[PDB]
Ligand binder design. Structure first.
Ligand SMILES: NCc1ccc2c(c1)CCO2
Ligand SMILES: [Cl-]
Ligand code: NA
Lengths: 305, 305
């Protein structure tokens, strides 16, 4: 028993992290087969940062301008190109530690593990969710750009995030591994802000099921509700709308615990309208929304990688 | 910016996890050099759980009674010995993936990463603290025994915990890697119960310093306290006593933020009296006690906001 915010084991990704230096700028790269991926803003000085022309900045660069270190071994860059906001550095050696992998783009509300890295060395791992406002509430210091996020399904690593920047509120923005930003952000120093965030309803429900499975039941009640009724409540409390597909995804947990989703929606309605009355749920005084239904099932089932 | 419960990258430990089978029982083992460490209760049978005599159970075993599987490979057991509550199986292959490592016994309040494993395969990684009552609040299902906890300050893995059992309240008990239990617990199924747990005061103070470093000051006040008056108050809320050692340990964070340790104690006193009045600290509505002073310094910027 027990329920913890849990990251995937990070070993398969640790073996892919390299250090990329261009000029005075050092950050992290992802080395897979014979390509190192990193943010294209690595090629900017701080003046270009204000309004960069990335194709122009890249023309000046020769392969030898990119210093890439894998541990204490240098990698020789033999080609370079840009895809959206990522730079792709062709190297002369395929990574012998390349795992089975795919590039995937995730949806807001989905969770993933972040391997935070500095100078090509993994420093920590934690679990994140893509917020509805397309930021992530990460923990990142200067030098962490190019750190990546991922999930593991079977033996295949699905890379979903590469870290690019921090917004003024201290939350974080980045791209998928094809260099498309999550959210309405751009890689330059201009005025940018996170939009108003909302709470991930299906994830809060999943976490209430996790609580019940772990013996925390005080919030259960006799009442049920309807989607249209609940979604009016959700809107009022800045929760994402709950869809029928969300209800279906929670089906397993409803059958396992004997609490139908709209039964649990009635619990959540009452929590939103009245608070927790001094109690906690799974050790939290807040409603937790960064566990997906799959996360709850997986941790309450013991799946391995 | 940001502040997360952050585990160490798990890859160095992942490459040490094996499966140990004795009879009908399978759990996890830790393979370092040519030795596999696992809980000695793997040799218990179903009527041997209340008062097992481990010396008598072990003398009846031959090396080939121990099945050790490392990934797809069977390891050959060529010797065995018991040390306190751990079994040490000598095998005929040194683990080629053995990291630099040491065995460290930790004190209550210390944090570490847990690599949850089932059948020798890692499932996930999360952060735990050794509670004042010598339990940990983990996430462990049947088959998780022999999972380990560790830190990796620099490049050396300090192994500090091996999981043995779950107590009636759902919390977890285990040993150091020399097989000595944390707390008054024994590897018998006779009824035992964790002592009343308390809050790790020095860690809460660390986390409040983390909140100031990341730019939040709302909970400070104009007051101070003597160390003894602080302790007289905090023990009425089930907080651990704060010692001069703890005050010394917090010196660096005090210097970085400009807030004297006993002034931060006065802030904590008021937080216990008032609650948070609808506010949060580093995203939490409760006072967090599983970040040590060392953790905060490792994760936070060196420049206060
Ligand atoms: N706006 C994120 C960002 C961060 C660094 C950097 C750039 C953008 C361009 C030059 O270097
Ligand atoms: Cl310690
Ligand atoms: Na109900």
């Amino acid at each position: 028993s027990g329920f913890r915010k849990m990251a995937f084991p990070s070993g398969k990704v640790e073996g892919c992290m390299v250090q990329v230096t261009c000029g005075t700028t050092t950050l992290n790269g992802l080395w897979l087969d014979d390509v190192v991926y990193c943010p294209r803003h690595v090629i900017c000085t701080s003046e270009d940062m204000l309004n960069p022309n990335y194709e122009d900045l890249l023309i000046r660069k020769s392969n030898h301008n990119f210093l890439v270190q894998a541990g204490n071994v240098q990698l020789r860059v033999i080609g370079h190109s840009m895809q959206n906001c990522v730079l792709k550095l062709k190297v002369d050696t395929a990574n012998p530690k390349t795992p089975k992998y795919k590039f995937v783009r995730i949806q807001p509300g989905q969770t993933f593990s972040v391997l935070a890295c500095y100078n090509g060395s993994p420093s920590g791992v934690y679990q994140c969710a893509m917020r509805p406002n397309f930021t992530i509430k990460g923990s990142f210091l200067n030098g962490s750009c190019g750190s990546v996020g991922f999930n593991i399904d079977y033996d295949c690593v699905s890379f979903c995030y590469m870290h690019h920047m921090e917004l003024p509120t201290g939350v974080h923005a980045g791209t998928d591994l094809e260099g498309n930003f999550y959210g309405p952000f751009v890689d330059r120093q201009t005025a940018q802000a996170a939009g108003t965030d909302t709470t991930i309803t299906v994830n809060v429900l999943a976490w209430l099921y996790a609580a019940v499975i772990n013996g925390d039941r005080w919030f259960l009640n006799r009442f049920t509700t309807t989607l249209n009724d609940f979604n009016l409540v959700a809107m009022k409390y800045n929760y994402e709308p709950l869809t029928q597909d969300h209800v279906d995804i929670l089906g397993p947990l409803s059958a396992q615990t004997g609490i139908a989703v709209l039964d649990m929606c009635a619990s959540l309605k009452e929590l939103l309208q009245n608070g927790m009355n001094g109690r906690t749920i799974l050790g939290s005084a807040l409603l937790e929304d960064e566990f997906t239904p799959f996360d709850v099932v997986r941790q309450c089932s013991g799946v391995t990688f």
